[PDB]
């Protein structure tokens, strides 16, 4: 049955490249997936759809000026490995905040019957907060699992710890949990020991260390994932091991965050 996962983490650390490459690896082995992009600039489905950008629900509900008058085939397009793609977007030419844009997007999907019988995973590519609008990708009938993409810097780790605070302070005792820390590389073999040390302190795991490799940039100027553009690359096998690890994961925790006194100690021990 449908496991609903959501990717959180800091700005610019690699959530949409890790999400799309993980999903491509999942589709390659047989899993049936839907990516729902929860970012104002539609860029969560480009490497799967080979699109310039996908046409958002919030640019087909203000364009068509609807209330309840829009079709699912106009926002759910299939791409590589048969992955289904939805793009929420913001009121990006309009006015306001995103957040709520995700709410009037997975409610649309629910109403239009997008969550079908043979779907294995639904990945939401959200942002930096498990609060309100951006947390209804985590509500009662929604995502059970959260994976935080982070790295060796102070601000990526601080973001992981604060997202983790938002997960313990998820509304009422339903069941939104932390599945692990995906470390997206930036240094060498001391950075992985830093993320493992934070993870053990939060009560999770570093479910995979993703290397920094230029094939990623080569694949995406060509609008693809590394699994599609270059299946035999060592990096492709990195997202397939992350994909295997997420598929077998049974360590959904209710995290135990550290104080800023403690994160500074960990960071001081390293850089
Ligand atoms: N493993 C990697 N190897 C090489 N480059 C990478 C890797 N992971 C991410 N990148 C690159 O670093 C950048 C970060 O990726 P991306 O923009 O998808 O992160 P993001 O957190 O989703 O961004 P945002 O905060 O805007 O939502 C991109 O330019 C991407 O190509
Ligand atoms: S509107 Fe947040
Ligand atoms: S609105 Fe957090
Ligand atoms: Mg992104």
From Swiss-Prot:
Keyword Iron-sulfur: yes
Entry keywords, A to Z: 4Fe-4S, ADP-ribosylation, ATP-binding, Iron, Iron-sulfur, Metal-binding, Nitrogen fixation, Nucleotide-binding, Oxidoreductase
Induction entry: Constitutively expressed during log and stationary phase in sucrose-limited cultures, its levels decrease during stationary phase (at protein level).
Binding site for [4Fe-4S] cluster: 97, 131
EC number per UniProt: 1.18.6.1
Cofactor dependency: [4Fe-4S] cluster
Pfam families: Fer4_NifH
Entry binding sites for ATP: 9-16
Reactions it catalyzes: N2 + 8 reduced [2Fe-2S]-[ferredoxin] + 16 ATP + 16 H2O = H2 + 8 oxidized [2Fe-2S]-[ferredoxin] + 2 NH4(+) + 16 ADP + 16 phosphate + 6 H(+)
InterPro entries attached to this UniProt entry: NifH/chlL_CS, NifH/frxC, Nitrogenase_Fe_NifH, P-loop_NTPase
Domain of life: Bacteria
A GO MF label: ATP binding
Posttranslational modification: The reversible ADP-ribosylation of Arg-100 inactivates the nitrogenase reductase and regulates nitrogenase activity.
Modified sites of kind ADP-ribosylarginine: 100
GO biological process entries: nitrogen fixation
Manner of cofactor binding, per the entry note: Binds 1 [4Fe-4S] cluster per dimer.
Modulation of this protein's activity: Nitrogenase holoenzyme is subject to 'conformational protection' by FeSII; under oxidizing conditions FeSII binds to the holoenzyme and reversibly protects it from oxidation.
Similarity comment: family membership: Belongs to the NifH/BchL/ChlL family.
Subunit structure: Homodimer.
Function: The key enzymatic reactions in nitrogen fixation are catalyzed by the nitrogenase complex, which has 2 components: the iron protein (component 2) and a component 1 which is either a molybdenum-iron protein, a vanadium-iron, or an iron-iron protein.
Other remarks on this protein: This subunit is associated with the molybdenum-iron nitrogenase component 2.
Protein name stated in the entry: Nitrogenase iron protein 1
């Amino acid at each position: 049955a449908m496991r609903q996962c959501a990717i959180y983490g800091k700005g610019g650390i690699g959530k949409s490249t890790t999400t799309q490459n993980l999903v491509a690896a999942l589709a390659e082995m047989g899993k049936k997936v839907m990516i729902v992009g929860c970012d104002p600039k539609a860029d969560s489905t480009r490497l799967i759809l080979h699109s310039k950008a996908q046409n958002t629900i919030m640019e087909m509900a203000a364009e068509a000026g609807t209330v309840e008058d829009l079709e699912l085939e106009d926002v759910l397009k299939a791409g590589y490995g048969g992955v289904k793609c939805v793009e929420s977007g913001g009121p990006e030419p309009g006015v306001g905040c995103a957040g709520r844009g995700v709410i009037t997007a997975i409610n649309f999907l629910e109403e239009e019957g997008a969550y079908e019988d043979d779907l294995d995973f639904v990945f939401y590519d959200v942002g930096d907060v498990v609060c309100g609008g951006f947390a209804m990708p985590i509500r009662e009938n929604k995502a059970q699992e959260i994976y935080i993409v982070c790295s060796g810097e102070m601000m990526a780790m601080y973001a992981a710890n604060n997202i983790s605070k938002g997960i313990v302070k998820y509304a009422n005792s339903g069941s939104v949990r932390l599945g692990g820390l995906i470390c997206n590389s930036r240094n060498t073999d001391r950075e992985d020991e830093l993320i493992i040390a934070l993870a053990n302190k939060l009560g999770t795991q570093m479910i995979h260390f993703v290397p920094r490799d230029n094939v990623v940039q080569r694949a995406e100027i060509r609008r693809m994932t590394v699994i599609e553009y270059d299946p035999k690359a060592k990096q492709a096998d990195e997202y397939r091991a992350l994909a295997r690890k997420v598929v077998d994961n049974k360590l959904l925790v209710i995290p135990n965050p550290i104080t800023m006194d403690e994160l500074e100690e960990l960071l001081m021990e390293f850089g």
